[PDB]
Amino acid sequence: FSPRAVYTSGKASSAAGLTAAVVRDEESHEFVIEAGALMLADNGVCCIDEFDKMDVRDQVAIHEAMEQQTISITKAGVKATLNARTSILAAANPISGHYDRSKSLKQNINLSAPIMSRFDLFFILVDECNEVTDYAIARRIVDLHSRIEESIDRVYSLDDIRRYLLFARQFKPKISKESEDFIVEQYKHLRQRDGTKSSWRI
Amino acid sequence: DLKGHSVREWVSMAGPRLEIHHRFKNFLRTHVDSHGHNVFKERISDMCKENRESLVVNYEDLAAREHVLAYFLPEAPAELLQIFDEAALEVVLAMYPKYDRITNHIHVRISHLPLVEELRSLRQLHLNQLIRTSGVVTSCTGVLPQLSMVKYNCNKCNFVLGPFCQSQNQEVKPGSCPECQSAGPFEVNMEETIYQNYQRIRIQESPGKVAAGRLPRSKDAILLADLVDSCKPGDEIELTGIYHNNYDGSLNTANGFPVFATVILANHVAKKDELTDEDVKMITSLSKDQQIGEKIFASIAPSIYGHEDIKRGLALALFGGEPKNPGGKHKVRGDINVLLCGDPGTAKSQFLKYIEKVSSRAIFTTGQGASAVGLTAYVQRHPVSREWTLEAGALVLADRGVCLIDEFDKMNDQDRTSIHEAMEQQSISISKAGIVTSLQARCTVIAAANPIGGRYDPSLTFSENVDLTEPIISRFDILCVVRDTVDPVQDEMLARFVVGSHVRHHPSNKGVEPLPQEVLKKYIIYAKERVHPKLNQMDQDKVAKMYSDLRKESMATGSIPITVRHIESMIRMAEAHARIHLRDYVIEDDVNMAIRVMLESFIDTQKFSVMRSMRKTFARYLSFRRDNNELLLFILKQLVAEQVTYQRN
DNA sequence: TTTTTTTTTTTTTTTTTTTTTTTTT
């Protein structure tokens, strides 16, 4: 859906191809920069499937990108500080292949603490073996596979949503005093939540 | 004077050439100011006085007084600028006839050019024109000596040949020597030749200016004989220069298209961004405030709320102690290393970054490899310079400054060994390729770390809930245990702080008084460089009794004991606190404050039960300069928290 | 005959992959 959206895998991407690389221009004395997956997601999204499987040598780069939004390269006779303003949608399998509900999120996955720290949202999708949910899922899947082109009545076409997203991204909302007080109270309550235990501290 | 067929050819003619020459001379003489009568008078005076051999000329005034010359300028920069140099030389001689002995030449630099472009907007249309751009210097070579006025030496008849002025476009080829009429090889004659400094830099688009789906572009520039060393890598610079193209650049080589490389002949450089006098009065003026200690302790990382004790420790680390080596066989470091161990989300990295920002010769590195410079030394060919250099470890780079180490508990084995060596012996020993050397790194290490398991548990002593061996922790003078404990009042206050910061830094809108940061660093410089307190007034009786009591108490329980190095650290912190006040003699209150800080750290390093044991046993020491309100508020908060826990269980 | 552009060669370094080794359950 999203333009400037780049999808990758766990171990299928190396460091250079995932962040950046440098080659020398074949026609002059200057050097050109091969843009890695992170860069192509600039002002977009990077979808890292099987994140937990990614090598540490690459996870350090992803952590750097999340930290300062930028990639610093000193290679092949050229230095550069390039911009990577990308959001990261990661998909990580729980350690052991199944999510264990009797542990904190820190233990259920093999992500380093710095990586998890700067993830704004963690969504846990446990496969509760409920019959109603299974019936609904089966109905939807079979309806999809029976009626391929139809059966999808989306109120807004993907092109319309793309245009609306591109227009709305330009807005820079303010924070009024009332909203500031509401944020303060909500944060107070959310911290009080952590006073049973939660999947991870707040 | 719009007339003719070609602008460059128009200036080429002798007539308009001399017309422009004399008009520019008259402009230099006559253009005075709105009120600064004859700015160029004092300009030339100062330049000659310091022997600067340069003249920065604003474009606005030149266009105002002589619009024709300003219009001609960008179209054919080479000829107009050469004429301006010729004019300014004789103008200077008229003002300073003797100065003719100095450089026999004057360069004219032009600034505030009206139209400013970006490296991505450069096109063939801009060839051979004065253009103003902005960018980050991404690489810069040494000050290479380039031939200026060569005198080749004929081999056959050993006759030196006349000066063949070197051109930036083509290499000079000598003819046949006038004497023996030989077209032989010839060789430079360095003793009789004269050169000019030649630096080559690369300027790339500022990342903050690049668009979303685009990559920064870069252009090569040449600085010549006076702009050299005016830039360093990482500088944001406005560069005005000639988009020169015709030197040798044409891909006539096979498997190549008729492309042309481009380099900007630099003509003016402006960096967009501390040895003063009479500021000693300023520093001394508030030095006698009698409460400056609180001011400075509150003037550290003003963007961080609370954590006052950590700020005090960082202030003491900044001002440092007094290194002393009795005889030459007992090396005692004057530094105050600090370790901030705490659960995440408590602004430890913020403190480290503030110290990076506020302290000169301060470098930042991380336990991970995400830092520009590593902790360990090595030797290699630098990737950008391609030159074989000894990359000294980060600690060495901060030889007399501050090394900030984030993720202190995620280092490598070799990184741990290197930090141990630096902290222990204050030097690094390298034997990597053939360099058997020992270079000293007298750095103050300020480290940040998280407890094992991501949460600090007071039921366990400090040394066991941190992924650091005892020898490493034993070399830190202050241990700050930052704990994130749920507290509604503090939570609300911090929420207000950060949300207000977010409000105030929106793009559209872009109990003492803390000192301004610039004055704070001036004070730090003066204190750290001039005042060297001596502890001739320390009460040995009090310190000895305190140490003996602490030994007895710590050994009375199964707790980490107090050792001599703790007394050493207390001495260093007392000297640092005296340095803050520039007393030049440690006073009883300085010693008491140092004892307070050292005991606070040592107590907080203990387990939960021993924490209260030593708090009650030494509450007198730990309460120095701690007014009644603070203790009463702490006790009330403890009681109300106990009530809350009883309520919600 | 004399220049010039290429040809090599001779070092050195750098990067990817694979393999080998070390640490943990």
Next chain:
DNA sequence: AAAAAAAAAAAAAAAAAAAAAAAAA
């Protein structure tokens, strides 16, 4: 005892600096 992560080996590719030879006029 066996798997996961790290380190080292090793082989292939690139830069490049300089000396010598073949082709051109």
